[PDB]
């Protein structure tokens with residue numbers, strides 16, 4: 010099994026105090042921390058072999074090109090795509106989903122067509138579709154949720170019709186922890202003549218992804234949530250769909266011939282990568298994938314199952330706390346204390362060294378569905394332990410007691 | 423003055439050999455090398471204060487947010503913009519120019535309108551306009567060049583008309599070294615009712631930029647050419663134009679309210695930054711700007727003037743070599759040897775440790791204007807010396823002699 014002491018030794022940032030208390034970082038659904046292997050990969054790139062790529066002209070240029078395209082093959086293997094032509098490097102999940110909405114949706118929707126999403130989506134997998142349907146005169150529809158914040162395949166079958174052209178859905182929700190039944194939803198979409206676009210930002214860092222098992226048409230993910238550098242992501246798309254989509258950005262590197270008025274494009278995947286690419290960040294994401302693969306995604310998923318079952322049990326020990334979403338879940342808990350605003354919960358916890366996030370988590374329609382204005386969220390990854398969950402629940406108990414005390418004191422004035 | 427020995431000590435990558443010879447890196451117009459101050463800024467971020475930004479919830483989150491928005495203010499001051507609302511972080515110059523073509527051009531062009539560019543443009547400042555004019559039924563026109571590869575203001579006045587809505591032009595050409603008269607061209611555009619979009623990728627690393635003197639409406643630049651990390655750039659636009667342009671990408675972070683079907687946007691600049699941003703890379707670009715400012719952009723420009731006047735003189739000592747572009751120029755020389763393909767020149771030079779680039783330099787219409795299929799380019803920056811120019815011209819002389827020798831030997835068979 011994975012040894013959590015040995016894993017934590019690899020993350021320099023965990024070893025410090027905040028406000029006089031050891032840091033307890035429980036905000037990896039907002040962004041993850043990085044191991045030495047990734048930070049030293051960036052250092053070795055800038056100290057030894059930085060150059061621009063795809064010249065084949067000089068020695069450092071060749072080294073940088075081999076590093077960048079090597080990282081593309083690491084991503085391909087990591088999500089079990091069939092080809093490097095299906096792996097496009099982007100700035101992040103949000104840009105990957107925008108590319109699909111601009112190049113696929115805006116080119117393939119007409120009045121009467123539908124895009125189907127769900128109430129639990131993150132804004133990155135809502136607003137691009139709102140705009141693409143507005144641009145095309147198509148219709149946006151929402152799959153409803155069950156009362157525990159899961160999706161039933163009967164509701165999917167009801168909402169998706171033979172006029173649906175695109176179903177877009179998260180693999181795992183960054184608020185509910187729900188793992189959605191994507192392989193079954195891809196069957197339903199395809200049976201109705203639609204493609205499925207999967208927002209993989211919260212699944213890819215935490216569980217194995219196999220796009221040939223899922224059969225998703227597009228899948229998007231972000232490096233900064235999976236121990237890799239900021240500023241980089243991937244869009245996977247089945248090669249036959251990418252071949253027919255036009256580029257979302259235009260420039261150098263993605264062309265073959267440029268005349269005064271007309272140009273032709275390079276083959277995939279470079280068609281979709283305009284400009285000097287994100288060279289160091291993509292090589293660092295390759296290092297993150299080597300790091301996670303050496304531990305094992307199934308080992309990390311098993312650890313997070315342990316931490317989430319422990320947290321849900323310990324949260325049920327607290328009076329006056331509501332947890333949103335299903336019992337079977339990814340490694341996060343979003344909650345509120347009955348009489349304390351979640352921002353004040355996050356502030357008090359940060360004074361005890363503990364980092365969580367409060368707000369809408371970029372899911373305003375979901376907060377409205379939950380009937381709340383904001384929530385607090387503790388989210389876990391491979392470097393967190395049950396002792397840190399103990400600290401969190403002990404701090405929530407003291408938070409409850411503190412706010413009730415100030416209430417009672419103020420009661421006289 | 424700047425001491426080049428002390429400056430070179432700050433760039434670890436320069437201190438190595440390639441093919442048994444000290445590296446001589448003369449390819450900074452393709453990408454620049456980074457000083458310790460920038461690489462250690464990225465290390466300190468990932469080792470100490472990485473977190474997602476714009477929560478205001480927990481201590482590391484606040485540190486990362488202060489670093490990211492602090493770097494925005496460093497960029498503002500660095501190009502003398504009036505406000506941080508005018509500084510948008512992007513993935514690079516190519517994406518910045520694409521944002522203008524998508525959000526400004528596609529929204530403001532109609533049949534009969536013109537976009538005016540020049541024959542010397544890089545593809546990143548050609549293809550987006552080709553696509554925007556195609557999408558809108560507008561017209562693309564080209565300002566012609568003088569025979570030394572400069573632009574005359576009379577040709578600008580002739581080509582720009584009262585139907586012109588956008589003039590897009592490079593500040594400095596990455597092939598000719600020409601510095602274009604942007605402040606005068608911005609007057610001409612504005613006199614005709616157009617905006618001017620300036621491609622600053624090759625000017626910003628090498629000379630002071632003052633967008634209030636230039637009066638450009640939009641200005642785009644790339645971190646990786648100015649000692650900063652890969653994957654980041656900036657788009658500057660005058661605040662009154664950005665206020666009226668819609669976003670180019672949609673998602674979390676750039677919204678204020680999201681309903682099921684409609685959303686509203688945040689104020690500038692965050693309106694144009696969808697998704698988790700390029701946090702480490704933007705903080706590293708802030709470090710690059712602090713590094714360059716401590717040396718002085720005018721000092722770096724004076725050094726490069728020295729190196730370019732030295733190189734042009736030493737190239738004129740070589741028989742059988744053609745240099746393209748004007749005598750008064752930025753710090754690069756693009757050339758060809760009369761009877762040797764530029765790819766073979768670059769290969770031979772790399773065997774002597776010397777890195778240059780051969781090909782079309784993402785300027786195919788310019789190569790056609792020059793009547794060549796490809797060229798070789800040696801480009802300079804603050805860490806290069808006249809001794810490295812001596813090495814280059816000595817290697818070109820030996821290249822000439824080598825290819826003539828193989829020619830003569832093969833002459834019998």
Ligand SMILES: Cc1ncc(COP(=O)(O)O)c(CNc2co[nH]c2=O)c1O
Pocket residue numbers: 038039040101102103104131133134179181182183208209210211231233370371474674696697698699
């Ligand atoms: C499910 C999901 N979709 C899309 C995104 C957008 O990814 P980005 O482009 O890398 O920002 C995120 C990141 N969500 C969060 C980022 O900070 N707290 C979060 O919950 C997400 O978790």
Ligand SMILES: Cc1ncc(COP(=O)(O)O)c(CNc2co[nH]c2=O)c1O
Pocket residue numbers: 061261283284285286451452453514515516517544546547592594595596621622623624644646783784
């Ligand atoms: C004048 C100019 N415009 C735009 C670009 C595109 O900038 P990017 O988006 O950062 O790639 C470059 C980079 N030009 C070169 C990149 O490699 N050799 C070059 O000459 C350029 O020099």
